Amino acid sequence: QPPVQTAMRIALWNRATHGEQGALQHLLAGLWIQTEDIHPLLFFDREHAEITFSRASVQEIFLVDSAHTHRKTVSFLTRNTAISSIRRRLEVTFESHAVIHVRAVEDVARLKIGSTSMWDGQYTRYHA
């Protein structure tokens, strides 16, 4: 059997699988490292409702203006800390309690512009 906290994630996961309980987001809270060089990183700061985007020299935060769960997908509308003009849409699709797939789309000024992103790809939550 796995460690305690690990089971809690699976327990929490089960409540979101068919349970469709309020929070699937609770599984996102923490550090996520991209799969497939230097790995892009996502940290979902639950306390401050932020999402920090990192890749070496690249580091930046977007405050969550909204967040909605549907089935197995959390859809974020985030906004840059410095400039309100620059925002970012996220499509976090869970595969497992510690495995997701992210799609990101920038939104400068007010029209969303959506080619492939450096943040697009599979992520796995960090565990020691």
Swiss-Prot record:
Classification of source organism: Bacteria, Pseudomonadati, Spirochaetota, Spirochaetia, Spirochaetales
Protein name: Uncharacterized protein TP_0751
Keyword annotations of the record: Signal
UniProt keyword annotation of ATP-binding present: no
Domain of life: Bacteria
